[PDB]
Enzyme design. Structure first.
Site, PDB file in Angstrom:
ATOM      1  N   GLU A 103      61.475   7.779 -61.703  1.00  0.00           N
ATOM      2  CA  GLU A 103      60.540   6.777 -62.281  1.00  0.00           C
ATOM      3  C   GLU A 103      59.127   7.255 -62.113  1.00  0.00           C
ATOM      4  O   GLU A 103      58.749   7.735 -61.031  1.00  0.00           O
ATOM      5  CB  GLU A 103      60.723   5.370 -61.595  1.00  0.00           C
ATOM      6  CG  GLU A 103      59.992   4.314 -62.344  1.00  0.00           C
ATOM      7  CD  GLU A 103      60.032   2.949 -61.789  1.00  0.00           C
ATOM      8  OE1 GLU A 103      60.537   2.809 -60.666  1.00  0.00           O
ATOM      9  OE2 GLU A 103      59.571   1.984 -62.446  1.00  0.00           O
ATOM     10  N   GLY A 152      57.261   4.202 -52.042  1.00  0.00           N
ATOM     11  CA  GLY A 152      57.787   3.451 -51.115  1.00  0.00           C
ATOM     12  C   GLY A 152      59.277   3.605 -51.087  1.00  0.00           C
ATOM     13  O   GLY A 152      59.835   4.015 -50.107  1.00  0.00           O
ATOM     14  N   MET A 169      62.942   3.376 -54.106  1.00  0.00           N
ATOM     15  CA  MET A 169      63.310   3.424 -55.508  1.00  0.00           C
ATOM     16  C   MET A 169      64.721   2.863 -55.697  1.00  0.00           C
ATOM     17  O   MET A 169      65.670   3.276 -55.024  1.00  0.00           O
ATOM     18  CB  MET A 169      63.277   4.847 -56.001  1.00  0.00           C
ATOM     19  CG  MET A 169      63.637   5.046 -57.442  1.00  0.00           C
ATOM     20  SD  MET A 169      62.478   4.152 -58.536  1.00  0.00           S
ATOM     21  CE  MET A 169      63.586   3.730 -59.881  1.00  0.00           C
ATOM     22  N   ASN A 213      67.287   3.256 -57.644  1.00  0.00           N
ATOM     23  CA  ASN A 213      68.264   3.989 -58.518  1.00  0.00           C
ATOM     24  C   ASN A 213      69.616   3.284 -58.301  1.00  0.00           C
ATOM     25  O   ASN A 213      70.049   3.040 -57.167  1.00  0.00           O
ATOM     26  CB  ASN A 213      68.398   5.415 -58.119  1.00  0.00           C
ATOM     27  CG  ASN A 213      67.060   6.081 -57.910  1.00  0.00           C
ATOM     28  OD1 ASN A 213      66.299   6.295 -58.859  1.00  0.00           O
ATOM     29  ND2 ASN A 213      66.792   6.442 -56.673  1.00  0.00           N
ATOM     30  N   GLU A 245      64.247  -3.445 -53.340  1.00  0.00           N
ATOM     31  CA  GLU A 245      65.035  -2.485 -54.105  1.00  0.00           C
ATOM     32  C   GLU A 245      66.390  -3.100 -54.441  1.00  0.00           C
ATOM     33  O   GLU A 245      66.901  -2.871 -55.573  1.00  0.00           O
ATOM     34  CB  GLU A 245      65.172  -1.169 -53.431  1.00  0.00           C
ATOM     35  CG  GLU A 245      63.825  -0.581 -52.983  1.00  0.00           C
ATOM     36  CD  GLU A 245      62.706  -0.489 -53.987  1.00  0.00           C
ATOM     37  OE1 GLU A 245      62.921  -0.522 -55.188  1.00  0.00           O
ATOM     38  OE2 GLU A 245      61.512  -0.412 -53.575  1.00  0.00           O
TER      39      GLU A 245
HETATM   40 ZN   LIG Z   1      59.884  -2.653 -57.686  1.00  0.00          ZN
END
Ligand SMILES: [Zn+2]
Ligand SMILES: CN(C)c1ncnc2c1ncn2[C@@H]1O[C@H](CO)[C@@H](N)[C@H]1O
EC number: 3.4.11.2
Length: 866
Positions: A117, A257, A259, A261, A294
């Site tokens: 991203e 920070g 992610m 996925n 997340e």
């Molecule tokens: Zn976010």
């Protein structure tokens, strides 16, 4: 570098439905084979335009025919003369070891990991790297088994094998179509914490947290928090995990920070690793927040994704709202709300007053990695919160449910989300939509009148948003403006008009309007913009006594805190003006008395008392001023601390002692008591020098947890106590091998009030625990100096600006994302006096001239210099 515009969005000429990836992994030369199934939707004569960056193309096949009708162009592979349906096969090479930008496939220590991203997948292979292209992935990973025993990708394992020459392979399949930004790959050697969560319908999910060898001792809290997140999303939102395995990998080298996925989150280790001797309460609660965040994206971001990057807040505003609600339900709602409002007013409003101002749905982006902002995130969440205020919980959840019914398995827009809320609730959000398109902070001015003849109370409320650098035209918003009226006993007066109740959320939709309330039997004290009901600046001519009244009587803890902030703001402003004339702090006795009352009130929550006793930060203070004088602000903050330390000495020491806890627990009541105790210790440190030195040194040495040890250490540095240098050396000697713990120490160094802080910081570039190759070290030393020591950064000699230019000159080449984070304090030049503006402008001009200036910096620098 050319801007992209939201209004230019058009549906893609080609889709990809399915992609099968093979990686032959090696840190110096990785070979990627990508087999994609494609469908043409546009005109027969339109080429397929694939994005790619820094790829070595080996071959291009279409239905297994080597293709000749193609060309490479900047950033792209353009393939012509295709059938309507076909199989694309690309083979290309990439070099993880060379990737210092940490975008695409890169090295973290000895591990290989990805960040895709926003637009990192195009660093791995040629692809439709846009989030409205959703495809089913299969990923086969081949690597040296000793170096890379674990080979992870999204989903579940479908195949595995061993090869000659010590290589092995694992293949993964994720059934859910995804945009490529949610692709992940990890290869390495890890310790693994394994657990399970059973969903409310009975699906057993395997939970796996992957950490560097020898870090298992720091993994249980993150696992705990994952399970808490899963349970809460079920309880509050009715959402269950949708896969069989949930993997988290903690890596030391990461620009963000963490992610989201799908099924394979990758986290900066700062937001995973904690034990009582290494991590503070705040660290614990930040791990909880980010683990939650997340996880929450699994629905708000993954199951429904973004049509395009200008819709980023569709996932980020809503996911931050969810993270806030999660923390608030589990913990102290008021402490959460207070600290989210501190962020809004102290950091977000600065952005909205800066050259980088943008609406929560941007209209123009050069580098999308520059738009992961306080605006998109935190203001985004305030916009979601406003919808929640307007609708109520029950209608809000009906909107959530319609949103997923309509959009599950698709890429959607912010407008889709608003429409779902509007249609489910029957609340009209047409005007409300302007919050998405208009930048800048509204200023809401309130006048009042009490008519004893008619027993009516009238509020006259006006709004305007000043123009911002990005938008010359502004219009009124739909501002939900919550009030409460208090009688002389502190009791809430019922709101009514013409014999009927009136909702306490006023709809402030015009440039000016009046609201009249009847049966107001006593002149009220109003609580205005209750719980920060809209992200606006409030202009009301408060008396001191109205504010201390609210501090004693207001029903919601937030209002009590906010009233204290309004009372302090008057006196911060007064004392900054005095400092510029060389005059000492002035503070009325009745102001000090209001803080004494909070210290001695047995009935107040300690969580609330601690926040009232935490002065506004130098950022929150800067927001009170048009032109920022950072030295005056810093010195006023210190003097105010010293004044209160002296005036409240006996009470501060009593409450300090009363809140001693011998056991350490990561539990909210305990946290509250500790925050209160350490809030008192901050003032005591700025008291009489010998008592201060004794108290602080003893806490540091006697602490049985990092919260208490760091609160003491930070107080020794802030008050320049005798014990400071011993304690700082002591910490370095104990913790130098532990980068996450040393980050705290770099922050204290960078934020020191000492006269020679810049010399110290420069010297620390050579420290054993520092390295320019690690984003966390960079942020903790250089970032904290520039951003959180505005008094030293803005030294009148210009030395701070010069130091930042030196560091940026390295980082622009090494890691543009981190460089762009770090340039922010220089782009604020129009808030400072002319002499500073001239120096900051020269610094910006120097950077504009760099060879190979990154897009990331180009965007910011050109806005700033306009
Ligand atoms: Zn976010
Ligand atoms: C001044 N800048 C650039 C920032 N200052 C403080 N927090 C920030 C900033 N830029 C982004 N963020 C935070 O990063 C997170 C997303 O990566 C968001 N939570 C946003 O607040």
């Amino acid at each position: 570098p050319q801007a992209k515009y939201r209004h230019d969005y058009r549906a893609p000429d080609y889709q990809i439905t399915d992609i099968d990836l093979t990686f032959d992994l090696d840190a110096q030369k990785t070979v990627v084979t990508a087999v994609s199934q494609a469908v043409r939707h546009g005109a027969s004569d339109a080429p397929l335009r694939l994005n790619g960056e820094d790829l070595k193309l080996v071959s291009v096949h279409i239905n297994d025919e080597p293709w000749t009708a193609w060309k490479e162009e900047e950033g792209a592979l353009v393939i012509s003369n295709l059938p309507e349906r076909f199989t694309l096969k690309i083979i290309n090479e990439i070099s993880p070891a060379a990737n210092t930008a940490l975008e695409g496939l890169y090295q973290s220590g000895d591990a290989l990991c990805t960040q895709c991203e926003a637009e990192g997948f195009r660093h791995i292979t040629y692809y439709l790297d846009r989030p409205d292209v959703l495809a089913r992935f299969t990923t086969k990973i081949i690597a040296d088994k000793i170096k890379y025993p674990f080979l992870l990708s999204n989903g579940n394992r479908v195949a595995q094998g061993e090869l000659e020459n010590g290589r092995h392979w694992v293949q993964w399949q994720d059934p859910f179509p995804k945009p490529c930004y949610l692709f992940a790959l990890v290869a390495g050697d890890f310790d693994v914490l394994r657990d399970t969560f059973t969903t409310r319908s009975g699906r057993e999910v395997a939970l796996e947290l992957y950490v560097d060898r020898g870090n298992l001792d720091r993994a249980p809290w993150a696992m705990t928090s994952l399970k808490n997140s899963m349970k809460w999303d079920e309880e509050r939102f009715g959402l269950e995990y949708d896969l069989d395995i949930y993997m988290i990998v903690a890596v030391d080298f990461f620009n963000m920070g963490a992610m989201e996925n799908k099924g394979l989150n990758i986290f900066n280790s700062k937001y995973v690793l904690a034990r009582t001797d290494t991590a503070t309460d705040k660290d614990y609660l930040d791990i909880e927040r980010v683990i939650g965040h997340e996880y929450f994206h699994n629905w708000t971001g993954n199951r429904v994704t973004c049509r395009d990057w200008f819709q980023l807040s569709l996932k980020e505003g809503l996911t931050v709202f969810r993270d806030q609600e999660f923390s608030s339900d589990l913990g102290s709602r008021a402490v959460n709300r207070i600290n989210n409002v501190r962020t809004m007013r102290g950091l977000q409003f600065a952005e909205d007053a800066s050259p980088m101002a943008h609406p929560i749905r941007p209209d123009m982006v050069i580098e999308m990695n520059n738009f992961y902002t306080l605006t998109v995130y935190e203001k985004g969440a305030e916009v979601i919160r406003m919808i929640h205020t307007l609708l109520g919980e029950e209608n809000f959840q009906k909107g959530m449910q319609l949103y997923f019914e309509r959009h599950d398995g698709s890429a959607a827009t912010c407008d889709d989300f608003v429409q779902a809320m509007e249609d489910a609730s029957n609340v009209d959000l047409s005007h409300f939509r302007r919050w998405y398109s208009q930048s800048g902070t509204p200023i809401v001015t309130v006048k009042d009148d009490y008519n004893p003849e008619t027993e009516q109370y009238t509020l006259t409320i006006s709004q305007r948003t000043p123009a911002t650098p990005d938008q010359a035209e502004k219009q009124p918003l739909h501002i939900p403006f919550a009030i409460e009226l208090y009688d002389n006993e502190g009791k809430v007066i019922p709101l009514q008009k013409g014999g009927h109740p009136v909702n306490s959320v006023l709809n402030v939709t015009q440039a000016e309007q009046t609201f009249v309330f009847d049966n107001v039997y006593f002149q009220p004290v109003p609580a205005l913009l209750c719980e920060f009901s809209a992200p606006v600046k409030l202009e009301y001519k408060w008396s001191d006594q109205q504010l201390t009244f609210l501090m004693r009587h207001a029903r919601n803890d937030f209002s009590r805190w906010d009233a204290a902030q309004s009372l302090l703001a008057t006196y911060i402003k007064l004392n900054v003006a005095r400092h510029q004339q060389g005059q000492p702090l002035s503070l009325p006795v009745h102001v000090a008395d209001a803080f004494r009352a909070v210290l001695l009130d047995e009935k107040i929550d300690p969580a609330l008392a601690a926040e009232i006793l935490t002065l506004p930060s130098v950022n929150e203070m800067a927001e009170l001023f048009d032109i920022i004088d950072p030295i005056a602000i810093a010195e006023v903050r210190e003097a105010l601390t010293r004044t209160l330390a002296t005036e409240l000495a006996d009470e501060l020491l009593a409450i300090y002692n009363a809140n001693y806890q011998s056991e350490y627990r990561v539990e909210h009541e305990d946290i509250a008591k500790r925050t209160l105790r350490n809030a008192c210790l901050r003032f005591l440190a700025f008291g009489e020098t010998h008592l201060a030195d004794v108290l602080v040194s003893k806490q540091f040495h006697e602490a049985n947890n990092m919260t208490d040890a760091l609160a003491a250490l930070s107080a020794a540095v802030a008050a320049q106590l005798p014990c400071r240098d011993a304690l700082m050396q002591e910490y370095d000697d104990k913790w130098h091998q532990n980068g996450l713990v040393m980050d705290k120490w770099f922050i204290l160094q960078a934020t020191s009030p000492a006269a020679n802080v810049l010399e110290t910081v420069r010297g620390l570039l050579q420290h054993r625990s520092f390295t320019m190759s690690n984003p966390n070290r960079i942020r903790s030393l250089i970032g904290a100096f520039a951003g959180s020591n505005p008094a030293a950064f803005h030294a009148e000699d210009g030395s701070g600006y010069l130091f930042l230019v030196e560091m940026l000159t390295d980082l622009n080449s090494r890691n543009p994302q981190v460089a762009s984070r770090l340039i922010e304090p220089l782009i604020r030049l129009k808030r400072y006096d002319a002499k500073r503006q001239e120096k900051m402008r020269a610094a910006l001009e120097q950077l504009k001239g760099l060879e190979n200036l990154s897009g990331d910096l180009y965007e910011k620098i050109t806005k700033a210099l306009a």
